[PDB]
Each structure stands twice: as structure tokens, then as C-alpha cells.
């Protein structure tokens, strides 16, 4: 991202700090990717403090993608990873509330656009 390079420079960095990871769901049928990423996060030795999950590329979600997204987030939470969500469109944003995803990650950790999630995470890592 140029969104990434701008916020990084605002925080005096060129590279994403070790504490922050970023993953995007690509398209509505992000299931195979969700599964892989969940597997990777489970198998690696060190985990990030914060993971931003970008939803800008998800045009809709049904019960099947909701339950997939839920299980993925549960699997990160159980390793100590704080999960932020960014970029849900207007309809997926309503679905995330109705389905309990917002509950799961916390209202304060849901961002309309990625640059505000990235800004918030870099600020939290600096305080920590």
C-alpha cells in the first residue's frame, strides 16, 4: 500500500513493525485463504500483537462466510492476538454487527478504512 507507506512515515518508520500483521480477505469466497492463514498463525513460533483484517474486497457475506470469519478470529484471539477490522462496505458493516462479529472483536477495534486501523495500531504499539 501507499496508504501503508504514508502512515508508516507519519510514525517515523519505513517497514511494518514486528508487532503488527495485516491480512486481507479477497472476495466473498475467502474460505480457502481463511483456512491457510489460520493454519499459518497456528504453526508459526512468534505471533504479532495486532492483526488488521481488511474487508474492503468482500462485497457480501452469508452465514457461511460469517461463521468462517468468526472461527478465524477465535483462533487468533486464543493466541493473544488483538484483531482489528477495516474497510467493511455499508452492507457488510451492518452484517458484522447483526452477526456478533463486532461484539467479538470490540466496537473500538472496527474502522471504516484501513488507514485509520493502521494509525490506531501503530499508536497502540508505540504506547506498549
82 binds, among K ion, a copy of itself, none (CB under 5 to 8 A by kind): none
**Residue from 7, 16, 53, 122 binding a copy of itself (CB under 8 A):** 16
Which is nearest to 65 in space by CA: 111, 113, 27? 27
Owner of C-alpha cell 462496505? 89
Which is nearest to 55 in space by CA: 25, 28, 99? 25
The distance of closest approach from Cβ of residue 71 to a copy of itself in the complex, given in angstroms and rounded to an integer, is 8
CA–CA separation, 111 and 128 (whole Å):
21
Q: Which positions lie near a copy of itself, rule CB under 8 A?
A: 1, 4-5, 14-16, 18-24, 26, 28-29, 31-33, 35-37, 39-41, 44-48, 59-64, 67-68, 90-91, 94-95, 98
Amino acid at each position: 500500500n501507499a496508504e501503508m507507506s504514508y502512515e508508516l512515515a507519519q510514525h517515523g518508520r519505513s517497514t511494518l513493525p514486528r508487532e503488527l500483521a495485516v491480512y486481507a480477505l479477497e472476495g466473498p469466497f475467502f474460505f480457502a485463504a481463511a483456512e491457510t492463514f489460520e493454519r499459518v498463525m497456528g504453526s508459526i513460533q512468534e505471533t504479532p500483537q495486532i492483526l488488521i483484517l481488511r474487508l474492503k474486497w468482500v462485497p457480501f457475506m452469508d452465514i457461511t462466510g460469517i461463521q468462517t470469519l468468526e472461527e478465524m478470529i477465535q483462533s487468533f484471539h486464543k493466541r493473544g492476538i488483538k484483531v482489528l477490522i477495516s474497510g467493511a462496505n455499508s452492507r457488510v458493516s451492518q452484517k458484522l454487527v447483526k452477526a456478533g462479529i463486532v461484539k467479538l472483536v470490540g466496537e473500538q477495534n472496527v474502522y471504516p478504512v484501513f488507514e485509520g486501523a493502521l494509525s490506531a495500531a501503530l499508536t497502540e504499539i508505540e504506547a506498549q
